[PDB]
Amino acid sequence: KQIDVMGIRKILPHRYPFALLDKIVDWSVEDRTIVAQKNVTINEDFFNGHFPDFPVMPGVLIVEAMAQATAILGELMTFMLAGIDKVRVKRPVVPGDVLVIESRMVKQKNIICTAESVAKVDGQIVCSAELMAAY
Amino acid sequence: KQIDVMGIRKILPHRYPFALLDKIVDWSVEDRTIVAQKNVTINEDFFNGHFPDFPVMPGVLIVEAMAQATAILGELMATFMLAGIDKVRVKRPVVPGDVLVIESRMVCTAESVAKVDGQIVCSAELMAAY
Amino acid sequence: KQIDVMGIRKILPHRYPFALLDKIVDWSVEDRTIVAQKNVTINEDFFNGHFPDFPVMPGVLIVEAMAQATAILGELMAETLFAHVRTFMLAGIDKVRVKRPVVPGDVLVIESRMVKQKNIICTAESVAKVDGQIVCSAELMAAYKD
Amino acid sequence: NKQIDVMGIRKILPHRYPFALLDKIVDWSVEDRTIVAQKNVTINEDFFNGHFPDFPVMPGVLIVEAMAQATAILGELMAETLFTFMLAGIDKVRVKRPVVPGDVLVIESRMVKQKNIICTAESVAKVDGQIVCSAELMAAYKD
Amino acid sequence: KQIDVMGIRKILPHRYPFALLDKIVDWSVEDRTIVAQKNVTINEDFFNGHFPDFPVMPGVLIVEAMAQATAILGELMTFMLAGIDKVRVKRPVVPGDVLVIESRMVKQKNIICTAESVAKVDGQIVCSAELMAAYKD
Amino acid sequence: NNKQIDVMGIRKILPHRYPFALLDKIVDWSVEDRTIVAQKNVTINEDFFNGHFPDFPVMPGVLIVEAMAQATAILGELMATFMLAGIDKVRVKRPVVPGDVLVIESRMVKQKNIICTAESVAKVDGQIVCSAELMAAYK
């Protein structure tokens, strides 16, 4: 139950600079669960503008990654983003942080789906979110 | 009333590829409001990935614009970071050629709407912290 | 008579970073005119270099957008245009006047009119306006070459 | 003596990547009011990805912009004895051959008119000593 | 013991797209050793061209990451790469791999310096090499 | 002239594409002598120069090495993709800055099943700036 970047490409149409997932560590047909890894390095173009004197990762991008993680799970049952409720960002994600991303389905309401995602670095909670995504 | 992209650079520390506001057209301290503009063009790198064969502005970049709009109004109240983001409604596809007008009303927290040619494309509630 | 970016691509081979037209607002084969639109934003790579202390669009990228709009017009008319006869590639530029700095947040409205045809060489006269103020005008020669 | 490397060129003009389109000055002369500059053309410039995906050729406007930067440099070199330079006018541009990766673009510019904050040049770009493009350029010195 | 990316920018002039180290995990001037990390993701420009159809990290950039951890260890005791030898590439390195870089200073004859280096993914060696750096300014 | 290959020809031979396409053209080659001569122009408009170094642009020596290896892989292709099995004896002598033209010469010295060994040098203005010994595998 391993999907590397190449498998992920057959699944989503996202590509550089908006493929924000490196691999799928594990997936659950049954549990409607997924876990993804996005590695975070100084050598990604956003870190130049956000921010010049302090590389931090855009929250919205973590969310986009959770979203992309959510979107894949879907395709395993495209899937564009319809909404994103309750989103809270506890910790700065920097270059070096491996980013581990868990996303679970909770609502299947007629060609729409909803998910809860949490994002962690060394186990800690850096971000959680409710993601709403359809098609 | 207005603030050009060089004014935005003295207020916020953001830069390329994450300066997502071209200019501030209005604001008002009294009223706790701001209107900003984000021009959208095929010549922005994110469209090469999102997606080949159909370039559409990703939802989350709409929010980030909204957030910078917000965090400038904020800075006029006297840098901010994005704590909470809530009630995010992605109506329509934003495409190369659309002009994005950004309304942010403070109520720190805020209500923001993003428009193309009158029409709402996005709305969201935005908590935020230094 | 509107053509979105996806439409431009069927017509012009240009892709990023040298696709400098968002959409065609209007065309007329009968009138040999075209209106195009280029949105100018600070999220464009060239604004980092021209200039780092003060982003303003390069004169020559304005011209290039004029040239692209003229080549779409060119294509749309190739049955008319080339009655008596593969991409349109710029062969001359002549009456270029740059009147105003074009800055991020300007919408760039581009008018091009084809005024001369001569055995594969096309001449158009273009102007570009920001908030209906004249920002640049040019005479473009394109050759329908390989 | 009459060379200026890319770092010298950085102190003369504010242009940076991706609109720094000169690698070095080869010769100049305030006395003859001419300058010889060089831009190397390589596949590993980004504009080649879009112009064109299946046939990389250097856009004509960029050759012109190379010539105007060389002209602006000549202007700056001549400033003391004429009194930033911005491109006000372009005329008579002829694009003569396609320029492709691996071509060394040698650029010659000669200042012909001084007319009150407005300068005016003739300029040619060459590849292997043959002309790929010519132009008259009109820069205006303004802050 | 640790140095974040910010600390790294004070020691080395390298910047994007040639900053090839995220952080120093540890060092030791006594043993003359350094361990670095470099995260490998699909979001990195060089993966577009190497290769479209199969993104794999260029050997020569793995080496450049080695030479950069080395250069740090150097100033912890600019360093310009003057020699490379016995470079062996074992294993391809792809998006998702975390890339641990260990360098160890071997010789320090005058102004020329020399290191032994290794790069690893999940513990196994993916590349090794001997590097010669001169401290030319 | 019968022995030139432009960038669109290099593309048919090697999968490397931007930003890791590092040869502009092949200038000469002998299938009999086991040689190739290629060129790579170097210019300020290359993105690595914004990082290497911000206040002083000079070509990473690893990139000179990568240009050599591509040259070497084209020659291997022409004698017959080749991957970079080994790099030995790399001398980085002179710094390479915008405005220089890298002339690259590769010489196939030995072979040992798929693994192949070349001697390779890099030239600016007839002077050597970099030399090395390369082991590419695969055929």
**C-beta atoms of D49 and F98 within 8 A:** no
Per the listing, tokens 């090395």 go with: F132
Give the position of tokens 């009011």: D33
End-to-end C-alpha distance for chain A, whole angstroms: 24
Amino acid at F62: V
Q: Which of F22, F59, F89, F90 would best serve as a mutation to test chain E binding (most E beta carbons within 10 A)? A: F90
Domain F1-139 is found in CATH 3.10.129.10: yes
Long-range contacts of D44-47 (CB under 8 A, 24+ apart): D44/F18, D44/F19, D44/F21, D44/F22, D44/F46, D45/F43, D45/F45, D45/F46, D46/C17, D46/C45, D46/D18, D46/F18, D46/F45, D46/F47, D47/C17, D47/C18, D47/D18
CB atoms A98 and E98 under 8 Å:
yes
Sequence-separated (6 or more) residues with CB below 8 Å from residue A110: none
What residues of D act catalytically? 51
Q: What is the rounded CA–CA span in Å between residue A87 and residue C33?
A: 50
Class of the domain covering B1-130: alpha beta
CA–CA min distance D13, chain F (Å): 14
Most distant pair of Cα atoms in chain A: their distance: 46
CA distance D70 to D83: 19
3-state secondary structure (DSSP) of residue D80: helix
Stretch 55-114 of chain A: residues touching chain E, C-beta under 8 Å: 55, 94-96, 98
User: Which residues does chain E have within 8 Å of residue F120's beta carbon, measured at their own beta carbons?
Assistant: none
Which helix (H) or strand (E) segment holds residue E66: the answer is helix E59-76
- Alpha-carbon distance A85 to B86, whole Å? 5
Chain breaks in chain E (C to N over 2.5 A) after: 77
Distance of CA B109 to the CA centre of its chain: 15
Cβ of D43 within 8 Å of Cβ of F24? The answer is yes
Residue F116's CB is within 10 A of a number of other CB atoms, namely 24
Residue A30 phi/psi, 5-degree rounding, is -65, -60
To one decimal, the resolution in angstroms is 2.5
Alpha-carbon distance of B126 to E109, in angstroms, equals: 60
Within 10 angstroms of residue C107's Cβ, the number of other Cβ atoms is 18
Q: Is B50 a catalytic residue?
A: yes
CATH superfamily name and code, C1-146:
Hotdog Thioesterase (3.10.129.10)
> Residue E131 forms beta bridges with which residues?
E84, E115
Mutate to test the interface with F, among E60, E63, E79, E137 (most CBs of F within 10 A): E60
The nearest alpha carbon in chain A to E7 belongs to: A54
Residue B123: how many CA atoms within 13 Å on its side-chain side?
Answer: 7
Spatial contact of B35 and B103, defined as CB atoms under 8 Å apart: yes
User: What subunits make at least 3 CB pairs under 8 angstroms with B?
Assistant: A, C
Contact between chain D and chain A (3 or more Cβ pairs less than 8 Å apart) = no
User: How distant is the Cα of C15 from the closest Cα of chain B, in angstroms?
Assistant: 9
The residue of chain D nearest to residue F100, with distances taken between CA atoms, is D40
Q: How far is CA A63 from its chain centroid?
A: 6
- d(CA B121, CA A83) in angstroms, rounded, equals 12
Top-tier CATH class for A1-135: alpha beta
Least CB–CB distance from D43: residue in F7, F47, F49: F7
Nearest to F59 by CA among F23, F95, F99, F20: F95
Active-site annotation holder among C14, C50, C99, C100:
C50
Q: What angle do CA F62, F68, F74 make, to 5 degrees?
A: 140
Beta bridge partners of D123: D109, D135
CA-based nearest residue in chain D for residue F21 = D44
The DSSP-derived string for C80-141 is: HHTTT----EEEEE--EEE-S---TT-EEEEEEEEEEEETTEEEEEEEEEETTEEEEEEEEE
Nearest to C44 among B43, B55, B97 (CB): B43
CB–CB contact E20 A40 (8 Å):
no
Contact between D143 and D79 (Cβ < 8 Å): no
Q: Check CB contact under 8 Å for C98 and D88.
A: yes
Q: Under DSSP, is residue B109 helix (H, G, I), strand (E, B) or coil?
A: coil
The pair of three-digit structure tokens given for residue D33, joined into one six-digit string: 């009011």
CA distance D90 to D71: 12
Cα–Cα dist E23/B128, whole Å: 29
Q: Which residues contact A107 (CB under 8 A, 6 or more apart)?
A: A113, A114
The fold for domain D1-143 equals Thiol Ester Dehydrase; Chain A (3.10.129)
Q: Which helix (H) or strand (E) holds A28?
A: strand A23-28
Q: Where are the domains of chain A?
A: 1-135
Return the SS3 of A73. Answer: helix
| Cβ atoms B114, B67 nearer than 8 A | no
CA dist E5 and E27 (Å) reads 15
Question: Sign of torsion, CA B1 B6 B8 B12?
Answer: negative
Q: Residue F71: how many CB atoms within 10 A of its CB?
A: 29
Interface residue D50 vs chain C (CB under 8 A): yes
E58 vs F contacts (CB less than 8 Å): 20, 66, 84
Contacts of residue C11 in chain D, CB cutoff 8 Å?
A: none
All residues at 6 or more sequence positions from C36 whose CB lies less than 8 Å from its CB, including other chains: C21, C22, C23, C24, C25, C65, C68, C69, C72, C109, C110, C112
Q: Can you give F63-91 as a three-state secondary structure string?
A: HHHHHHHHHHHHHHHHHCCCEEEEEEEEE
* CA distance linking residue A50 with residue A43, whole number of Å: 13
Q: How many CA atoms lie within 13 A of E16 on its CB side?
A: 18
The fold adopted by the segment(s) E1-137 is: Thiol Ester Dehydrase; Chain A (3.10.129)
Q: Which two tokens stand for residue A70?
A: 């959510």
Residue with tokens 């048919």: F12
- E1 touches F at CB < 8 Å: no
H or E stretch at F111:
strand F101-112
User: Closest partner residue to D45 among F45, F50, F97, by Cβ?
Assistant: F45
Q: Which backbone phi and psi does D117 adopt, to 5 degrees?
A: 75, -10
Q: Check B58 against A50: CB less than 8 A apart.
A: no
Q: Which residues contact A102 (CB under 8 A, 6 or more apart)?
A: A33, A34, A35, A117, A118, A119, A120
Which amino acid does the sequence have at D10? R
The DSSP string of F16-71 is --TTS----EEEEEETTTTEEEEEEE--TTSGGGGTS-TTS----HHHHHHHHHHH
